[model samples]
Target chain A: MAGPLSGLRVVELAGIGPGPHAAMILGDLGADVVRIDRPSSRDAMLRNRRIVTADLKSDQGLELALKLIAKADVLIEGYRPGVTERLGLGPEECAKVNDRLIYARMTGWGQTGPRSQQAGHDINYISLNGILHAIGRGDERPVPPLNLVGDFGGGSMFLLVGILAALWERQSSGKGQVVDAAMVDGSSVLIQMMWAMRATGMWTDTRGANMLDGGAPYYDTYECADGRYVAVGAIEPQFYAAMLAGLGLDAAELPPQNDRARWPELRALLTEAFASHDRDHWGAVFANSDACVTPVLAFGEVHNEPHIIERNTFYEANGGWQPMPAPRFSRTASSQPRPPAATIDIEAVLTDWD
Target chain B: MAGPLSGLRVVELAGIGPGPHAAMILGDLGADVVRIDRPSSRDAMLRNRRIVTADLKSDQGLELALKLIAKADVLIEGYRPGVTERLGLGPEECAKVNDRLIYARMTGWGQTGPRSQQAGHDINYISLNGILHAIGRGDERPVPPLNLVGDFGGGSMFLLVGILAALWERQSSGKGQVVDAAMVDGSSVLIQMMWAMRATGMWTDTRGANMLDGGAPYYDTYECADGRYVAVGAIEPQFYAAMLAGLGLDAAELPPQNDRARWPELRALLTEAFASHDRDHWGAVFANSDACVTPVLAFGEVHNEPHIIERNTFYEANGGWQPMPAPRFSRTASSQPRPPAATIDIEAVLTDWDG
Candidate 1:
């Protein structure tokens, strides 16, 4: 079980969204992550990690937590600016005992600002960063993408990057620092290319109107006869030609690939052609072609995809299927994550870390 | 400018989307990344990286590429699975040159999957992972959110994670490994919580019908009188009360916060309240409260947000407003990225590496 992060030790404070997700990832990568929670708290993300219940409000609990932090390489906290400070486990306090501890703070708005104390969820954080505004149809209101972008992508993922990067640096510097991972900042970083493109006038302010945002006729989703959908991303001319061939249409009869004026007509032709068959039929037509087309698999159907099945992408766990650990390695590959756990012996947890 | 990764050496094979982005982040974090591209190739992500040109078809070009790989600690590529192997610079080849070289492969599908050779994009990768199916309104077709989720988050970010983790492991084992980062697998990992909730019957197959989705009225967006929108995330009972107070509504007169059956009525009430004022007006009202509501700032307006302005989240670079490097460090903070370059001298790039 000595994965890439075998020697790392992480202390995770009980929280929701990105905090738990980041700890789950750290644990999956072979970090000796110990999740501390209130006595009554329960969660599926508490898996793999050695867990112990401790009420932070109690003196005994605070003492036990501090002792654990003193021996940890990383500590992750997801709360408002002052919650951890009030709990007497803030960066300043922990650094006193462990200057080399990487203290990661995950929040929606960030550490210092007018909105530092403001209440927000994934939707609000993405919205403020202009990410939510960039999503959905150009003609309709922007739609929320379930919290994947803000909560996990920007929030937990960024926190994980910061923690690991700092740990890498600690090998030389021998000193750790705080990693302020804000959803607003991380979500904003996700659109760096758009910012570069907008600078050159290659991108527009309209939602879903950009080339990659489903505005172009060459890239978008269309409904099949069965009401199921297939996504198309034939941006390259060669791929666009392949898409045409998949539909049994001649390229010479259609408008040029990048012709904006005829996009509506091109879309109309594509819509008609795709509607003639069910999603699975269209899937077969483009299966062996370079059309860049794929059916939008339902949650239940994702594991059944030929490609996914071949890769063994998802495995049954906890009464349902879950995605396997990512970024496969050639050596020291990560092992399957231990199933979720509940309370364990506090004395044993302390003994393992000590 | 001595950032955490200042001493790291990276060789990036110039490409689009996530590959370049990962290299850019590496460069920003102080890695000496040298991007090798064709003579005529140009890209915005060439910024912050040392740039060179090479033609793998030529013997001299292949020699130069191998030499650079020989002296580098990490290499990045974003082609179809076999493209690099065809170029004679695959992981096996690089490993022969330098056993400690970390080869990062970025793609939509992974290297050995059934769809490994298939042509696909961000939408296609995400669709196969069930991410596209979970987004958008339950009644409408799912919308693509550009390529943020797959290309950057799942693709580039995950690649960075793998490279760093492998590098960390290399310190102890004295051996390198291949990092196969696929957008499909990475994006699927992003929904671990949703899967947990679904297993407990807390989530639904219907798009946007879950609590975190736009299904809950309290956690959705509303349009103001000026047609601009404000996002609300009053998920907690206390925050719901604050939202009602912001709208000057009484809590006793309203339904319970989690009463799903009355969400439509609750949404209508909040819509009428929000519509009475422009987005900015409501923004001011909630500026000091914990209503969990805020205006949905447009891309152009994001830089002007007071908090964003204070933090300098986005700065003027290359005649454009681009985001600053994130996950700020207290000490050894990253420096500003240099503007994108066109070409570089081979001797100078080699000299820096040798030094």
Candidate 2:
């Protein structure tokens, strides 16, 4: 069967990071995504889509893009604010040809913020929005979390949500709208629970001093005997007891689970216990327990995992592994994602749309 | 204006973390959501929805839930694989009541995996899926990214995408399907670019040892004179030049930007430069430049940010700050979210559904 978005057509004004990622998702879910590149781009996260070169500065290229936009159901662009408008392909321009199109714009700051036009990456956006400060150890500088939070999580995912939501609304209204998806705005929303935790005094400003931020001994990663790591998240009382049992430690001899004053001591004890065995050893010991302890697998090691293999989470193709399309649908299952291509037949794309 | 999801109806089985977050987003988008709670819940991430209590074990409670399911366009539940099935509210049972319902299931492990029944948290899920190993400093054990990547980013966000995507497909099929969203699966998908980077020899397995993961001196956070922090992400050459100029440092004096071997020396130099002034001083120095440098604001300080204030990103309601619904739509704008409620009139909810 075809994917859920089998009949959808998307026109992506190719840029970097989140824009291509969002378009890749649309293609992964079986949308006929045609990405208009500016004579440049990458290989991965560019799968399942047709790519066509277009110099928007040229009148011929501009008309080709406009024609594609007129036939497209969604348009995604990731230029800095007003860049597309300056290119004469902004929301108003696209709406003139196809008012039923969802014109989606992606950026770090936003479309109308004080820093909208400024150059920034995922780190700067997350840093300004309070996520950077909330991460990392208590004594160390904030870690960047590998652009997962700001770029893909906040930027690409929210843009897709807006596009899909707009499509749903267009069914009744017979009109389209612009989705202003700013990384800063969406990343802030991703941390809503943290804000809620702060209001209730459940969280503190100090990094690594809270329960979920690696402050709690039972909820953090520990080094093992083989120099590998095992993450433990036995937050509940029973799970903590199970963790202690898996480590061959008695809870009666240790500090209370929620005692913040002795978290350091508890951490030391757990560290020593985990260090007594290799990661695989600990994994085996906690294999059937509710300790919430699991081995930390590197990116290259995920496909070998039992559960990962069982779920087919990462599929190997073209001598490398890539993640499958997510949130599996029962009926409209997404097909195997095709490898990224650098060129496409523009005439064929136009003919297919027609 | 009514939100984009104005005419939709959602039935949420109250659970912790990602389930309520997904429901909150649906409600924020103007979906008429009615949550069926078991005798417990939280006060936040539960906004814009009415709550009704139900004991799924009881016959009457199950019947009321089935009634709600019959009327809902979407059903969200974040239980373990078979917990709902054991409670007689699983996909098969719900489909019997309403075949057009989009049954969305949220879990750390998926419904049919080797570890599906195992108990896990955000840290454990991300750990198993390779996200935890990719985060944190080079020497330190992997530090959790505060559950942001797994619970919300991967779990809740992907669940919403599935529901919304399925909803769109249902417009023609007129049939509902189950959306099984697992945190491990979705979080792995979130790191697709990293896999791409790794394949192209741009990333490594070592933590804090990549261009994006705090390994690059030009793309990491640094401490300031006041013990505050500023994040610098001058990845492009122009931005890096701007950053060096903002710091009053010259490129000729410093090593090349992409020289990985001298990153430690570069890090020390930039650290010393940033420490010479307070966070605000550097923030001011780079405010007008494209250096990609900005003050690392705490959660409490975001409301005071000029851009945040100008955008109304966070609003003060009930004496506490909450983020507004995001990804602003030009036509169907979301309304101000209501504070979470603990109780609701069941009769009123059912009557409205009837009409």
Candidate 3:
């Protein structure tokens, strides 16, 4: 489908985690993204689509890449601080060719930091940034939701913002910018509110002990008979009322949702209330109401859920279903996601840029 | 410390959740965010901060807001669609007064959504957009992590993006634009990668079954002897080796970290091994090494952790350590962790705006 990002072109250099994810968002939204991959660097999942490859170490290949950069509207690369510069695809060199091109760089330690060239991952960045360290159940060693918090939440998401911001700015300035997207920086920014909450004395630094982090009885996940979970966020009276009423319970008889002393008892009550049936039964129970209740559908279950199915939120392709493109644009939006990307796509991209 | 956003001016008609959060980011980054708040609506959590409230329904209030808007770079509000127009502070009217003013609108539904004017929380917005249904451990029901994903993740974070983009645009256009930020839209965008992963047959549509969502052994959380939890994300071969090497276990003896079929067995083995010690033992063993291990400290405990303290990431105010200002800039970063707010000089604000 034609998208708002139609007519725009992007060159995505292959990297794992959020970099590809950021490029994917642009693709999903209708930007023609030519993903540059190493011929040896296979897709983590499958199907090499929209991909092209060339050995950067070769002088001929570098010339081709510089040519590609000149014709692109945006270029996304996930490399160390100056790896791109070393390969002759640095922002300065590329921008020299295309002054209007938005060059985005993603890294763990940012463009310049103590460990800019050191090895890192999602957990490593978030661990220092205070996101992963704050998540998970309180009493346990903090878990890294792999690199979701840093790689996706902070990294790719911010890159999307920076890219769009630069694009918008470029409209008037008629010039591009170098956007430094860092995992450590983005992840820290993601937790700013918690800091605000902390500064105000209204929040605690505890993990699962906080009302929002499964600390409160009413705002936590309670397991059901079939091992499916229900996440409750009914902290306010009206929503809790809906949850209680939907569950066929007496609200007046229940402990206050915010009552700290009663949290243990309330959690027990919720556990019992939810375990009475399977997740599907509860999903149906709260289907149409504002019960603040939903089943903890497994990854497999999301494709078949009624609401997801109705919204056509999950699209099917290779073997099974995954989530679909988002930010439903009124005029133009991403409908069909890009097929799995290739390591590089030179001819198709070059021809299109031309 | 001096921050990048220092010396900038913002007028926030503080709404709850993410809208304020965006302001908080600006404020934390050293921007002088003059929050115009509702006096009666103030809660203990938001108390003691510098705030002003005028009955926007009153002409005097609208005039005051316009005055503030005129002196501001951004005006952010989180109300249902058309509520601003009804309050006489709509974008069309405000833009006339301050054409270069960055106006940010934060909402659950987009300005054009079917439920744009309805009352909804983060849970509803997220559920409607297909995020709330994908989290949590395997259980019978889905739970809302309150309104974080919708309210903060999408709503507040995107609002920040909108304002920043408009701010950047203003540098050239010499004018501002309307930024439509909604929780549903923003949060939906946040799941952009997962959607891509799913599209290409990489991400499972189900919860708790993907490598990032507790599906992989090396990537999931496990319980220790004291019922404490710890997370590991040794995805690469080297990192995986580091983890196993820390445990005195052999990397060659274990399945590849990326192997899908072996995740469960690996998780079970890791779980059993982790249960042998409390989180502290692991933290000690893994610290200063590439084991990529750490204790899953709670909120209170987090305040006491070494890395947190060393980074000075959390600040002590409002009686306890909450998060501090973020995205630390090398030059001109935000002010101190706790700058006294809601208690500033409106007189100063007036002088600055009208000076």
Docking class of 3: incorrect
Per-chain TM-score of chain B, candidate 1?
Answer: 0.97
lDDT of 2 by residue, A285-332 (tens): 888678999999888778789999988888876648889999899999
What shift in Å separates residue A313 of candidate 3 from its native position after superposition? 5.9
For model 2, the DockQ equals: 0.82
lDDT-based ranking: 2, 1, 3
Please say which candidate is ahead in TM-score: 2 or 3.
Answer: 2
List ranges where model 1 is wrong by over 4 Å: A41-43
Model 1 TM-score (2 dp): 0.97
Candidates ranked by DockQ: 2, 1, 3
**Top DockQ: which candidate number?**
2
* DockQ of predictions, in order shown: 0.74, 0.82, 0.22
Error of 3 at A31 (Å): 5.6
Q: Tens-digit lDDT track for model 3 on A1-354? A: 354466667887777767887776666656677776666622322222367887788997788778888888889889877789888888778878998888888776667634555566776676555566555565544544434457766777677766765565465558887777777666666665565566556567666677666576766666777875665667677878888887778867878777888878877777888889887788778765556665555445555555456555556665455455544433233476656653445766677666
Candidate 3 lDDT over residue span B68-175, tens digit each: 888888888887778888888898888888888777888775676334554556666665555765655443244444344677656676677657645644554477
lDDT of 2 at B163: 96
Clashes of each: 0, 0, 68
Write one digit per residue (lDDT tens) for candidate 1, span B2-54.
57787888999978898998898887778788889888752456677878999
RMSD in Å for model 3: 5.2
Q: State the number of backbone clashes in model 2.
A: 0
Native contacts recovered, in order, as a fraction for each? Answer: 0.73, 0.83, 0.19
lDDT of 2 at B343: 82
